[PDB]
Amino acid sequence: MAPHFKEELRNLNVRYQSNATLVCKVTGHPKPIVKWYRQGKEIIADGLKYRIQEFKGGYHQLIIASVTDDDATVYQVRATNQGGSVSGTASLEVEVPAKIHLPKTLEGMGAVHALRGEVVSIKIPFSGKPDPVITWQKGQDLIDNNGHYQVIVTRSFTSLVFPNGVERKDAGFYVVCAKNRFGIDQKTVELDVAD
Ligand SMILES: [Cl-]
Numbered sequence: 001m002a003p004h005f006k007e008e009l010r011n012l013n014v015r016y017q018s019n020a021t022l023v024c025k026v027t028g029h030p031k032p033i034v035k036w037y038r039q040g041k042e043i044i045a046d047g048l049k050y051r052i053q054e055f056k057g058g059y060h061q062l063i064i065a066s067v068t069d070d071d072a073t074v075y076q077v078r079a080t081n082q083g084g085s086v087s088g089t090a091s092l093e094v095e096v097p098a099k100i101h102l103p104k105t106l107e108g109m110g111a112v113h114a115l116r117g118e119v120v121s122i123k124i125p126f127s128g129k130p131d132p133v134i135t136w137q138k139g140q141d142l143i144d145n146n147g148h149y150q151v152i153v154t155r156s157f158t159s160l161v162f163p164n165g166v167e168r169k170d171a172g173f174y175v176v177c178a179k180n181r182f183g184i185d186q187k188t189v190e191l192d193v194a195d
């Protein structure tokens with residue numbers, strides 16, 4: 001009997017830093033040998049990031065520890081005997097709730113100290129999967145790109161920039177917010193401007 005997946009690999013949605021477990025059940029005679037792959041590159045069990053467990057009745061399990069977005073990909077499992085070889089595939093998607101990560105806080109909030117005319121960037125790392133929506137406000141007036149401010153949003157941070165150089169009036173309290181479907185998080189940064 002050529003190998004068969006009696007129970008196929010399942011797609012997984014797993015929360016960041018948890019362990020992800022991929023399981024399948026394999027039939028075949030002679031008993032198939034199972035290899036595991038991350039996007040087409042063989043995974044070698046090392047006992048730490050990757051562990052393999054096999055049980056009676058043809059069950060085969062891979063445990064991927066402490067899952068990062070790096071682990072969020074397509075996985076293959078292959079079963080092979082002298083009668084044939086077949087693979088199954090599943091995806092792992094890693095849910096990270098939206099979150100703002102202030103490098104430095106003073107008295108509760110972020111703080112940026114600037115001199116007049118300095119081209120300031122308020123740079124704010126964040127997390128979230130799905131990628132979150134980002135907004136900035138000053139107190140409570142939304143900011144988009146106009147003639148005064150520029151917003152940068154990349155995969156991992158957002159920056160509020162004062163491309164024309166800060167003016168004394170730029171002093172105040174800026175609120176940055178990251179939102180996805182696993183949640184919302186906001187933080188405030190105080191800017192002060194020195195002359
Ligand atoms: Cl990036």
Ligand SMILES: [Cl-]
Pocket residue numbers: 116166167168169
């Ligand atoms: Cl000014």
